[PDB]
Amino acid sequence: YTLATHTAGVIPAGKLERVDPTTVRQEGPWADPAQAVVQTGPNQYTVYVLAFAFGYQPNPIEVPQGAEIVFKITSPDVIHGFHVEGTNINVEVLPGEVSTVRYTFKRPGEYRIICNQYCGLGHQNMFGTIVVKE
Amino acid sequence: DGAKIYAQCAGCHQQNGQGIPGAFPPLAGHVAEILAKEGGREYLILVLLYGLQGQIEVKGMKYNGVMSSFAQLKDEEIAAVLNHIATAWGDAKKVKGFKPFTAEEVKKLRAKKLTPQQVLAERKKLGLK
Ligand code: HEC
Ligand code: CUA
Numbered sequence: 001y002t003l004a005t006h007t008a009g010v011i012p013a014g015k016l017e018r019v020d021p022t023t024v025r026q027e028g029p030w031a032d033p034a035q036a037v038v039q040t041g042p043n044q045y046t047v048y049v050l051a052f053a054f055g056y057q058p059n060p061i062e063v064p065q066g067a068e069i070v071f072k073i074t075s076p077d078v079i080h081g082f083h084v085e086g087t088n089i090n091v092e093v094l095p096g097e098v099s100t101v102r103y104t105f106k107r108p109g110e111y112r113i114i115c116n117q118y119c120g121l122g123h124q125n126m127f128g129t130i131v132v133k134e
Numbered sequence: 135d136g137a138k139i140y141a142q143c144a145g146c147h148q149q150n151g152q153g154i155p156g157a158f159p160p161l162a163g164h165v166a167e168i169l170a171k172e173g174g175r176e177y178l179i180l181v182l183l184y185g186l187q188g189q190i191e192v193k194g195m196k197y198n199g200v201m202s203s204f205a206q207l208k209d210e211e212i213a214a215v216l217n218h219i220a221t222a223w224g225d226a227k228k229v230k231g232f233k234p235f236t237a238e239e240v241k242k243l244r245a246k247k248l249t250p251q252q253v254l255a256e257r258k259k260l261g262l263k
Binding site for chain 1: 156
């Protein structure tokens with residue numbers, strides 16, 4: 001039933017989006033926390049999220065509710081995870097791999113991202129901040 | 135040099151040295167605060183080599199992140215960025231007799247394998263919440 005609805009957006013894209021995790025933080029859509037949110041259609045906004053060492057860029061991830069947000073998260077170092085507490089977003093973030101997930105926030109508030117995937121001694125404190133605008 | 139490594143600091147603390155509220159603490163007008171403490175300079179190196187991880191409260195603002203363990207960088211590089219940031223904002227000019235970070239101080243700490251989770255205690259021991 002999930003594949004027969006827009007709920008399938010919470011599932012990572014089937015298309016491969018491999019890039020260079022070394023310069024992805026210096027050159028590219030993940031090299032600027034300002035132009036991270038780019039409109040890609042009617043009420044559709046693509047947000048590039050860079051998941052580096054114990055951090056997430058941009059932060060806090062401010063996005064509008066009632067719109068289709070195309071989250072494109074990638075890692076420039078080790079493996080990470082994009083599990084937003086309070087949502088259905090649970091996708092793995094690999095190094096140099098752009099995990100694309102389409103979400104639609106129907107409720108505002110502050111959400112914390114839980115990085116399930118290991119990463120150093122402070123992997124448990126790797127909590128990103130998401131703020132959906134009402 | 136210090137500028138080359140500064141590019142890495144900009145990834146979280148930005149080029150403004152303000153950071154992100156609730157994620158990354160500020161450096162401008164904060165390094166001097168630590169440099170004035172007994173062992174504050176050592177902490178600055180430890181927080182770079184290994185890091186820190188908790189919910190520190192700077193100026194009443196609490197965060198929830200982790201310092202990046204720049205152990206992959208050379209001792210000279212680690213000291214270079216420290217000297218660069220301290221002189222960049224001029225925080226090193228707000229202390230009496232600022233001693234430039236030397237690779238020697240980095241080496242002595244690099245030999246002592248610690249964890250960012252343990253550094254949290256060391257930081258709080260200095261009175262830093
Ligand atoms: C994200 C990948 C970071 C990068 C890159 C750098 N720092 Fe950082 N730093 C980060 C966090 C999340 C924190 C706070 C940890 C927490 O528990 O919330 C810090 C902290 C510091 C501090 C200490 C501040 C304090 O004790 O009040 C310093 C001095 C510091 N960071 C320095 C620093 C330098 C020089 C960097 C480039 C070499 C650098 N940081 C990068 C996250 C990140
Ligand atoms: Cu990044 Cu766990």
